[PDB]
């Protein structure tokens, strides 16, 4: 099975370095160059450059060049994208990826947030219930950096969940609502807690949301 | 540099249509050693790494099936989507594969077309645990809607708002086709003390009349 694993997400203030890791598996490594390629969030796909591991054929974009290094580790099988002196515009995920178009394998991508906030937890709030269908929800609200996971009942409720996108607010944290709707009948019977998860700061909140 | 030129930016298919993507290249893909043009087609969902559909601009990748078909040479390429499903709701990408640096076209979004549905409107005001904090957000839900395109507009004791207020959508929902989406208002406490009626008013071809949810402080 081939797989290509990528290292962890990571946050980076504007003017420091990442260098991010792909770890290759399952096919003899110098079969395929590795390709590198990045989307910011919202936009369109941008290739980087390759490396070629057999040979040490390294190609990359003028975009980029002189501002990013691909390295490979032959011995372990991994390949690096080392990117200096880090802006906004490079906040993205970034994929390696084997071959051009004749072996199709992607890494899970890694996500680089170039920003001075501090990890955190959010503040969750709930948005009480006010045609039998009741809304409610929870109000996830100046967290850092994405992503936050959210579910209703442990699981047990995703029947009409609708948990947003994140925003980006001004102060550079992210705020969010997941909502569900639910029979106006059950609210005085049943419970309705929202499970917020935020791994980057080891965080787990559960918010019971009432009437 | 190739730029890679898509056409259009989004689309909506009914289920079971036709879809049609192009892309242009500012140079032949064209190969003289071969004779193949070197465009590929890739599909990306949102959060997933892209998955190649097409290349040599007409082969499918093994696994793809025949409903996908990539067409053109030289500058002018097609991807045709016959008998549309839901599983082909996502970006697609062309790339030039011919020369450095390899280039992508910007994306053409696929959704499925439904017929119109109105969105189901709900206010919140903020809660008190996030009142004692200073600042106070008050969330309007435009829920499960078709097209997305809808204007939200926020009013304070009558007073339109503007600069205050962020927007979220979801992706489209895969079963019924449906957006929902917030429109979350931030306000100073004290702001938020001083005012009485607050209101989302929102405007989507669904609805014959924009449906305004409204609250007083307090109450």
């Known amino acids: 099975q081939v797989q290509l694993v990528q290292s962890g997400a990571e946050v980076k203030k504007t003017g420091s370095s990442v260098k991010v890791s792909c770890k290759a598996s399952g096919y003899t490594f110098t079969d395929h160059a590795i390709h590198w390629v990045r989307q910011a969030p919202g936009q369109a796909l941008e290739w980087m450059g390759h490396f070629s591991p057999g040979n040490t054929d390294i190609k990359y974009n003028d975009k980029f060049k002189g501002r990013v290094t691909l390295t490979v580790d032959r011995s372990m099988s991994t390949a690096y994208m080392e990117l200096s002196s880090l802006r906004s515009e490079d906040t993205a995920m970034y994929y390696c990826?084997?071959?051009?178009?004749?072996?199709?394998?992607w890494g899970q991508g890694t996500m680089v947030t170039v920003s001075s906030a501090s990890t955190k937890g959010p503040s969750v709030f709930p948005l009480a219930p006010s045609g039998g269908t009741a809304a409610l929800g929870c109000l996830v609200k100046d967290y850092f950096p994405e992503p936050v996971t959210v579910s209703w009942n442990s699981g047990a409720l995703t029947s009409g969940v609708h948990t947003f996108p994140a925003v980006l607010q001004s102060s550079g944290l992210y705020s969010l609502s997941s909502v569900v709707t639910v029979p106006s009948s059950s609210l005085g019977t049943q419970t309705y807690i929202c499970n917020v998860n935020h791994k980057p700061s080891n965080t787990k909140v559960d918010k019971k949301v009432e009437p | 540099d190739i730029v890679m030129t898509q056409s259009p930016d989004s689309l909506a298919v009914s289920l079971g249509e036709r879809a049609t993507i192009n892309c242009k290249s500012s140079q032949s893909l064209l190969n003289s050693g071969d004779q193949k043009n070197y465009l590929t087609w890739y599909q990306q969902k949102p959060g997933q790494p892209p998955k190649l559909l097409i290349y040599?601009?007409?082969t499918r990748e093994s696994g793809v099936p025949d409903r996908f078909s990539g067409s053109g040479s030289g500058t002018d390429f097609t991807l045709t989507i016959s008998s549309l499903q839901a599983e082909d709701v996502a970006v697609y990408y062309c790339?030039?594969?011919?020369?450095?640096?390899?280039?992508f076209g910007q994306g053409t979004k696929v959704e499925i077309k439904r017929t119109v549905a109105a969105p189901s409107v709900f206010i919140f005001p903020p809660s008190d645990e996030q009142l004692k904090s200073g600042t106070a957000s008050v969330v309007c839900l435009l829920n499960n809607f078709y097209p997305r395109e809808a204007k939200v507009q926020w009013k304070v004791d009558n007073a339109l708002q503007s600069g205050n207020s962020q927007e979220s959508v979801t992706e489209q929902d895969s079963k019924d086709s449906t957006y929902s989406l917030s429109s979350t208002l931030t306000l100073s406490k004290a702001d938020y003390e001083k005012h009485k009626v607050y209101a989302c008013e929102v405007t989507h071809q669904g609805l014959s009349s924009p449906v305004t949810k409204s609250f007083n402080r307090g109450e």
């Open positions: 040599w601009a007409s």
């Open positions: 990826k084997t071959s051009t178009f004749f072996f199709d394998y």
């Open positions: 790339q030039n594969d011919y020369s450095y640096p390899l280039t």
